[PDB]
Chain A
Amino acid sequence: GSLADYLTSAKFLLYLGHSLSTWGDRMWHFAVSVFLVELYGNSLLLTAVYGLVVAGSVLVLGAIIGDWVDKNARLKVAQTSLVVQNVSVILCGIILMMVFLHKHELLTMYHGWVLTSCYILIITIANIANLASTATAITIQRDWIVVVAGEDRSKLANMNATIRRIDQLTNILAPMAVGQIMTFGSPVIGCGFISGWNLVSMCVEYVLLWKVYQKTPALAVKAGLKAEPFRTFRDGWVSYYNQPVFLAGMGLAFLYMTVLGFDCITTGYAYTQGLSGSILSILMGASAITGIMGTVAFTWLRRKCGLVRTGLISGLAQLSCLILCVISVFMPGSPLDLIISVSLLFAGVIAARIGLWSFDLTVTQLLQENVIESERGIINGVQNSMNYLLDLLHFIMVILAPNPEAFGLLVLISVSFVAMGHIMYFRFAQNTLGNKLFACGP
């Protein structure tokens, strides 16, 4: 009965839906990345262009997407989001398979611009898919995790942590599956498989969400119901500016500007120095494990010493491991100048990942619990927009100077920005638990 109890319940169905959504949307993302690379071939520059376009679009559009979410009905919003995202995936896949079948034929069928037109259409549709995914993630996580968790702060925390663990495991195990499939036949078949997976996943997820709605009756009472884009943008941004939790929300955003974060740094440096071929799997495993300890440490610290003090401790940890990284880069051993050094750098990045995940969970919970219900849309959309604005600045920094001394200067600047973010969070903390900021023991 207990096993049957959980299997039905109201948390497990939400977990299942989130897992399916993330799995589909990451397999498709990596498949899109590989296909475009195969088509053009120019690495680094094109990936950065794609990321820049994505971030620039999502900033502006999510600013309005939050408003559209907060002033409609929940079930309708979720259903619309799922439908849009999956239809977008199907159409983009159809076009990609078409251009693969007749590359040179489209290149000269009428003009040389057919190929570029198809390329920009692919970019546009893959973008629309990302907007839909952002919208559904916002609404599902924020609104439904807040309402289904009830009044128990402990249950809210456990649920946030479980979502983040599901996300890290899905990242580490998804690329691998995409690879095995894509490398077991002509590309046209991998695309087909991914599209079919997405469609069946959409149907099952709609059914699961309807079922969840039927078990939480408090999900139907929305307080508030019972040219214009510029106005919405301005109102959203000023509302974000005037919120009592502003300095906290900005503190997270400054953490996104960093070359010290994974993915970019690992690919770049390993390609320049240390390809190996087996160390990268170990690094992926280490990153996953440390993310998991970050989540569990967040839970324990929140239970023991409260929220704000959890943030301060997480910040201390991340800053210490990044000082280890800076000592590493300045060594006369010369990683690139300005084997021990790369190890030190990766260790710094990993422990910084621990601290970063703890801090992110803290800030997310603060947002969830201290924001008035009617704005559970505007504020979150604006925060996403700002995070991706800093990510765009990071991309500008990466593309500007690709030299080794440039990499050293980038490390220093990223550490500086992390420090400024943590200083703003410290000011927010002092403005709350004034004087007694220390003394973890109550």
Chain B
Amino acid sequence: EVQLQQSGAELVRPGALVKLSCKASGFNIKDYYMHWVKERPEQGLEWIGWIDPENGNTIYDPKFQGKASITADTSSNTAYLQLSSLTSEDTAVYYCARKRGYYGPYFDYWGQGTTLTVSSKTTAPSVYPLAPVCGDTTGSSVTLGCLVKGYFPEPVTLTWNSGSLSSGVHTFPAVLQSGLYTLSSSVTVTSSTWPSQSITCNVAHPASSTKVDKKIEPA
């Protein structure tokens, strides 16, 4: 069996220095070519460069020459990627790849991917929410919702319906704005419970331990 392990979950201030590890097990690193690949959010893959562990030759992409370095160590059987002068653009997912020769047909094995985030601020999230029932007519729609804003530097795991999760509940994808994060989740079920005894939504911030629950009241 062959596999490659990477460190992950890296948060970096812009302009700093960062290293990414790639540890190979099951084979000798010096016998292959090691390639590094970048993946931007909702963007295609890009090729960074490759290294020969035998003699340490490195070829990079022209657009990546000035700010990318690749090193290898055969004694510890590892490879390292060096990025310098990081901006907010550089946040991405990075992959380690193994190739046979100069013009090898394929990459047979890949890493697990490392998430690199160039961030500036860290704080806690604010959860302001309210169900709209101002001059409504139908009482068979329910359709309550909650909105959490200004997530500091993590991804919230808000759960609604107070563990009585009805199948009608959608967690909208979070979006970045003013260096913070915002998200919302709407549940439209149990129309008889609208106005009557209802449940609450609980949101927890892993990086801030901000586990708070709020119950949606009527207008």
Contacts and interface: CB of A to CB of B under 8 A. Distances in A.
Nearest to B58: A442
Given A151-B31, A152-B31, A153-B31, A304 B55 contact: yes
B57 interface: yes
Interface in B48-71: 52, 54-59
Label chain A's interface by main secondary structure.
Answer: loop
A372 B55 contact: no
Given A152-B31, A306-B52, A370 B101 contact: yes
B102 interface: yes
Interface in B75-109: 100-105
A152 B54 CA distance: 11
A304 B56 CA distance: 10
A436 interface: yes
Contact of B101 (A305, A306, A369, A442): A369
Contact of A244 (B31, B52, B100, B103): B103
A432 interface: yes
A401 interface: no
A109 interface: no
A307 B59 CA distance: 14
Given A433-B59, A442-B55, A370 B103 contact: yes
A303 B52 CA distance: 12
A250 B103 CA distance: 17
Contacts of B103: 244-245, 370
Interface size class of chain A, counting residues whose CB lies under 8 Å from the partner chain:
10 to 19
Given A151-B31, A432-B102, 19 more contacts: A151-B27, A151-B28, A153-B54, A304-B55, A305-B55, A306-B52, A306-B55, A306-B57, A366-B102, A369-B101, A370-B101, A370-B103, A370-B104, A372-B105, A433-B59, A436-B59, A442-B55, A442-B56, A442-B58
Interface string B16-53: 00000000000110010000000000000000000010
Contacts of A369: 100-102
Contacts of B28: 151
Contacts of A436: 59
Q: Would you list the 6 A-B pairs with minimal beta carbon distance, nearest first? A: A244-B103, A442-B56, A370-B101, A151-B31, A369-B101, A370-B103
Interface in A305-357: 305-307
Interface in A238-264: 244-245
Interface of A: 151-153, 244-245, 303-307, 366, 369-370, 372, 432-434, 436, 442
Contacts of A306: 52, 55, 57
Contacts of B31: 151-153
Label chain B's interface by main secondary structure.
Answer: loop
Contacts of A372: 105
Contacts of A244: 103
A153 B54 CA distance: 10
Nearest to B27: A151
A433 B51 CA distance: 12
Nearest to A304: B55
A152 B28 CA distance: 10
Interface string B185-200: 0000000000000000
B73 to A, nearest CB: 14
A207 B161 CA distance: 79
A149 B104 CA distance: 18
Contacts of B54: 153
Nearest to A368: B101
A306 B58 CA distance: 12
A153 B59 CA distance: 20
A307 B28 CA distance: 20
A307 B55 CA distance: 11
A13 to B, nearest CB: 24
Nearest to B60: A436
A119 to B, nearest CB: 48
Nearest to A366: B102
A412 to B, nearest CB: 35
A307 B54 CA distance: 12
Nearest to B54: A153
Interface in B144-190: none
B108 to A, nearest CB: 13
Contacts of A304: 55
A442 B27 CA distance: 24
Contacts of A151: 27-28, 31
A434 B65 CA distance: 12
